[PDB]
Symmetry: D2
Subunit: 114 residues, 4 copies
Amino acid sequence: LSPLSTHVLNAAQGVPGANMTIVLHRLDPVSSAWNILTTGITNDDGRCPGLITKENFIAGVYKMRFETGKYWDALGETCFYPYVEIVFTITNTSQHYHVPLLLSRFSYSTTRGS
Amino acid sequence: LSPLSTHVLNAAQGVPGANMTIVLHRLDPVSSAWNILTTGITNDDGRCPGLITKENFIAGVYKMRFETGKYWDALGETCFYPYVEIVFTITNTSQHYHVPLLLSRFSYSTTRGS
Amino acid sequence: LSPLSTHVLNAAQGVPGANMTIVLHRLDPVSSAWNILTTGITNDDGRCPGLITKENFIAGVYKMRFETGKYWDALGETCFYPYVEIVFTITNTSQHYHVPLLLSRFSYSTTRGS
Amino acid sequence: LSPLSTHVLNAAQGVPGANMTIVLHRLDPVSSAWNILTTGITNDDGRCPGLITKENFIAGVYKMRFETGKYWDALGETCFYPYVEIVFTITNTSQHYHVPLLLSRFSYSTTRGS
């Protein structure tokens, strides 16, 4: 079980954001590059298990990219945000981090969970 | 499994809202009196199982009252909201309804989930 | 200007929550019943000027009820929430209190502003 | 007056996010480049006037970067998010766009205003 999870909730329709692409990155501490770790597609419950193994979950800066524009477009609607990136700092590597996305066409939010 | 669930997340601290009192009511369609259905306390994950049985879960207007004033005072802080009541309409009783609360001392939000 | 303001924003459509009915109440300090202070209708910028005078804005527990179900109905859609009541405590009367509502059909939020 | 505005709210303390650095970029539609437009600091109302002139406000993709980690660090706290970037598409150049941030140490949200 991954130590990083996520959950996308469509707040306009009160349903899981199914079938959204999520790309996970870690900053290289040497150069300022973002290495891609994993790309995933949210399931019917709007989750994306297997984002990262415990072995590879080292301290550092991480970035989750949600393809919000493509998700809305596939539903036949435009989004103000073509994509959303959440950048967060991992320091204590023994905790579970939950990094969700709540989204309408014109707003979104995230909160760190456990 | 209750067809009604919740989840309290403390947004200021990024941890589950544990030990928060939650009261579920339903509106009497004859009078317009609210009646208490169940009272519970969130557990360590900020969840509150067993809010209602399947057989008691009929179409109507429901109310969840979260005891935010008392939750914050037990952490040694004040809350702008002495309590929060989420009133919601249920017509379709075969779906699952998740009615969470994201809370700091000075903000809250909720979104219907499944 | 009123020391209490609001702002309603339709997050589902990215536009001001125009023509939303808001009822302002204050808790009766003697009997803990609710007294009605005034009603208003938000303008095309989603605001509701002149909710209360400085002279009558005394310390206590206030409630703003936003008629979200009617507002959505007049947009031709259903809302999960027939209404939203935000209850909040006023102790320092010389502060400005901004109590907005950010809303879709299936979610809402509020935050204390100054 | 700038046709792009912002407002930063500290949702942990219910006050404006004052003295937060904001950097506004626009995407170059030929190469892939992000170009800086303006860097500001939020004033005491948590706003940043003069983000862009009307002349310079063209259709494209814009990014607003809020230095949330430094803001918290000057208040002696940690933030889960070292910075927050909001990427958004401008299509109608004659509208006002308000792109705020509501922020705690462990959560944030934004919603297109008008």
